[PDB]
Enzyme design. Sequence first.
Site, PDB file in Angstrom:
ATOM      1  N   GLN A   1     -15.104  17.040 -10.840  1.00  0.00           N
ATOM      2  CA  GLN A   1     -14.296  18.462 -10.381  1.00  0.00           C
ATOM      3  C   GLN A   1     -13.318  17.841  -9.349  1.00  0.00           C
ATOM      4  OE1 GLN A   1     -16.156  20.620  -6.066  1.00  0.00           O
ATOM      5  NE2 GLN A   1     -15.410  19.128  -5.540  1.00  0.00           N
TER       6      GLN A   1
ATOM      7  N   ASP B   1     -13.712  43.590  -4.661  1.00  0.00           N
ATOM      8  CA  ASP B   1     -13.005  43.142  -6.090  1.00  0.00           C
ATOM      9  C   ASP B   1     -13.353  43.631  -6.652  1.00  0.00           C
ATOM     10  OD1 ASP B   1     -11.366  41.924  -7.785  1.00  0.00           O
ATOM     11  OD2 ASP B   1     -10.420  40.957  -6.325  1.00  0.00           O
TER      12      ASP B   1
ATOM     13  N   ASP C   1     -20.922  27.066  -9.881  1.00  0.00           N
ATOM     14  CA  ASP C   1     -19.374  26.880  -9.037  1.00  0.00           C
ATOM     15  C   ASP C   1     -19.801  27.465  -8.134  1.00  0.00           C
ATOM     16  OD1 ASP C   1     -18.584  23.931  -8.171  1.00  0.00           O
ATOM     17  OD2 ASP C   1     -16.932  24.877  -9.257  1.00  0.00           O
TER      18      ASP C   1
ATOM     19  N   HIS D   1     -11.468  38.883 -12.259  1.00  0.00           N
ATOM     20  CA  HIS D   1     -10.916  39.332 -11.245  1.00  0.00           C
ATOM     21  C   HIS D   1     -11.408  38.751  -9.736  1.00  0.00           C
ATOM     22  CE1 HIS D   1      -7.830  40.921  -7.863  1.00  0.00           C
ATOM     23  NE2 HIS D   1      -6.958  40.875  -8.928  1.00  0.00           N
TER      24      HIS D   1
ATOM     25  N   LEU E   1     -17.783  26.425  -4.616  1.00  0.00           N
ATOM     26  CA  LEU E   1     -18.715  24.755  -4.553  1.00  0.00           C
ATOM     27  C   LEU E   1     -18.131  23.418  -4.637  1.00  0.00           C
ATOM     28  CD1 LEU E   1     -22.033  26.181  -5.501  1.00  0.00           C
ATOM     29  CD2 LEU E   1     -20.429  26.411  -2.978  1.00  0.00           C
TER      30      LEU E   1
ATOM     31  N   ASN F   1     -18.694  20.259  -4.722  1.00  0.00           N
ATOM     32  CA  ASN F   1     -20.135  19.544  -5.663  1.00  0.00           C
ATOM     33  C   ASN F   1     -19.431  18.744  -7.093  1.00  0.00           C
ATOM     34  OD1 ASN F   1     -19.407  21.338  -7.733  1.00  0.00           O
ATOM     35  ND2 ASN F   1     -21.068  22.440  -7.543  1.00  0.00           N
TER      36      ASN F   1
ATOM     37  N   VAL G   1     -14.267  23.185  -9.585  1.00  0.00           N
ATOM     38  CA  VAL G   1     -12.966  23.192  -9.008  1.00  0.00           C
ATOM     39  C   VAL G   1     -13.360  23.699  -8.105  1.00  0.00           C
ATOM     40  CG1 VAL G   1     -11.351  24.444 -10.235  1.00  0.00           C
ATOM     41  CG2 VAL G   1     -12.970  25.924  -9.052  1.00  0.00           C
TER      42      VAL G   1
ATOM     43  N   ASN H   1       2.480  43.276  -7.001  1.00  0.00           N
ATOM     44  CA  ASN H   1       3.652  42.741  -7.161  1.00  0.00           C
ATOM     45  C   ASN H   1       4.625  43.517  -7.863  1.00  0.00           C
ATOM     46  OD1 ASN H   1       1.031  40.126  -7.722  1.00  0.00           O
ATOM     47  ND2 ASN H   1       0.127  41.569  -8.805  1.00  0.00           N
TER      48      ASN H   1
ATOM     49  N   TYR I   1       0.390  48.270   5.936  1.00  0.00           N
ATOM     50  CA  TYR I   1       0.107  48.738   7.408  1.00  0.00           C
ATOM     51  C   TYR I   1      -0.376  47.498   8.510  1.00  0.00           C
ATOM     52  CZ  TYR I   1      -2.642  52.793   4.666  1.00  0.00           C
ATOM     53  OH  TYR I   1      -2.196  54.141   4.081  1.00  0.00           O
TER      54      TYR I   1
ATOM     55  N   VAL J   1      -3.755  44.453   9.118  1.00  0.00           N
ATOM     56  CA  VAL J   1      -3.765  43.893   7.316  1.00  0.00           C
ATOM     57  C   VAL J   1      -2.697  42.803   6.949  1.00  0.00           C
ATOM     58  CG1 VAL J   1      -4.222  44.252   4.690  1.00  0.00           C
ATOM     59  CG2 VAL J   1      -4.320  46.367   6.210  1.00  0.00           C
TER      60      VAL J   1
ATOM     61  N   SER K   1      -2.972  38.695  -5.592  1.00  0.00           N
ATOM     62  CA  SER K   1      -4.073  38.888  -5.962  1.00  0.00           C
ATOM     63  C   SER K   1      -4.736  37.464  -5.637  1.00  0.00           C
ATOM     64  CB  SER K   1      -4.853  39.459  -7.088  1.00  0.00           C
ATOM     65  OG  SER K   1      -3.941  40.525  -7.207  1.00  0.00           O
TER      66      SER K   1
END
Length: 275
Positions: A2, A32, A41, A64, A75, A77, A81, A155, A171, A174, A221
């Site tokens: 990993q 999303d 994973d 995405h 995860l 493990n 990743v 972006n 806003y 957020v 993102s």
Amino acid sequence: AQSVPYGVSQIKAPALHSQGYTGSNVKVAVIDSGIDSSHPDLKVAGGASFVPSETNPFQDNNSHGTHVAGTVAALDNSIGVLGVAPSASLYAVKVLGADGSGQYSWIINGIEWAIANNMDVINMSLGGPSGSAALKAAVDKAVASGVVVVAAAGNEGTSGSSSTVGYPAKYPSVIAVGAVDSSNQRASFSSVGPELDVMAPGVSICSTLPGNKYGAYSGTSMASPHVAGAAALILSKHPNWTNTQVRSSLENTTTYLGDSFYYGKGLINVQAAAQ
Ligand SMILES: [Ca+2]
Ligand SMILES: [Ca+2]
């Protein structure tokens, strides 16, 4: 074997993992393009799809959503990743179709679903140049209800002297997240403006892709999920903390980089934020 993406280490998440703070029992909604629940994973706990022509939220025809999800909770493990909060209860709220777009009503409906199902953190790696009374109402309702709402700043880059931060990131309720590279320099595509709140790694981010794959993408993102995961680790350590306390802590423990119009308060340090 990993691999730990640089972005996870750069915001100091591993430190909390070693103390036993990995985001367990914290519900995070990745609003999303859906999440490939078959990925080895990842472990998706549930979700919903508000895309009329794509009724299965656990099928990501874009990639995405699954990528953003991998940054939040891949995860811990012996494969792929490692997410910022690997024990997080990941929810797939599909509001974007295979082409990557989505009507605002689908997006808004997804925000409403998240509020009704008690999500602790909502991540929105999406946004547009225009808002709506309905969009503001949904994110403001989330926050009044105690949800931590994180969104990519956009972006759009710089443009003279005006803000290029998109909605719903724009806003005040957020948290707007811009992107920096591994050197803590601002990515040229990152949106700027007085609305920017914090920065997180957003260039060449390695994460999950549908079909048991891995690839790197760059964008605000990819920046956003780092802070969504950050909030989850803070909540695993401080379950009694409200959303405004979680935000103040993330905003008040940043590593200052240049001017806030470009870098907001700076790069997050989840180790310091978590206290
Ligand atoms: Ca893994
Ligand atoms: Ca904002």
